[PDB]
């Protein structure tokens, strides 16, 4: 005897599974090329300074 | 991150302010240029 309150949960988890199956390849290339908010985090802090100084000139 | 965002919004505010005041300087310079050329053209039209 399934009920209707739990339908929102199963719809949402099914849609999250569908969004997983749709674009696995983007997630795989995203994890492989560069670490999450690590080397990336560092380079944006050093490279924001170039737009800052470009505004200074 | 929110600090950088506040500095870039203040930055673009200053950019629009300097754009407007150099535009006003352009208007003043052009007005003086127009008056000087009117005087010169009238004077040398009478001269020639």
């Amino acid at each position: 005897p399934i009920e209707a309150v739990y339908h929102r949960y199963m719809v949402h988890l099914l849609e999250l599974a569908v969004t997983f199956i749709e674009r696995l390849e983007t997630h795989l290339e995203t994890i492989r090329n560069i670490p999450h908010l690590a080397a990336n985090l560092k380079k944006m802090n050093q490279a924001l300074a170039k737009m800052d100084i470009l505004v200074t000139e | 991150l929110e600090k950088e965002t506040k500095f870039q919004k203040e930055r673009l505010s200053d950019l629009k302010h300097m754009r407007y005041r150099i535009k006003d300087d352009l208007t003043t310079i052009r007005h003086s240029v127009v008056e000087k050329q009117g005087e010169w053209h009238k004077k040398w039209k009478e001269f020639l």
Binding site: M51 | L1, E2, T5, Q8, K9, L12, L15, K16
Partner: protein, 51 residues
């Protein structure tokens, strides 16, 4: 139906042990940083045009 129920229970116990080994992160500050990076992309476009 009950066999399907129990199979899903066992699969989600496996999923829960894999999650309990791999439970890191949040959800709302990611939305906030996505919003601010989109806004600064817009600001970058407008400042290039302004330049």
């Amino acid at each position: 139906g009950q066999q399907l129920l129990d199979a899903l229970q066992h699969e989600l116990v496996t999923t829960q042990r894999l999650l309990g080994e791999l439970d890191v992160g949040d959800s709302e500050e990611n939305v906030q940083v996505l919003d601010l990076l989109s806004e600064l992309k817009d600001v970058t476009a407008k400042k290039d045009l302004e330049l």
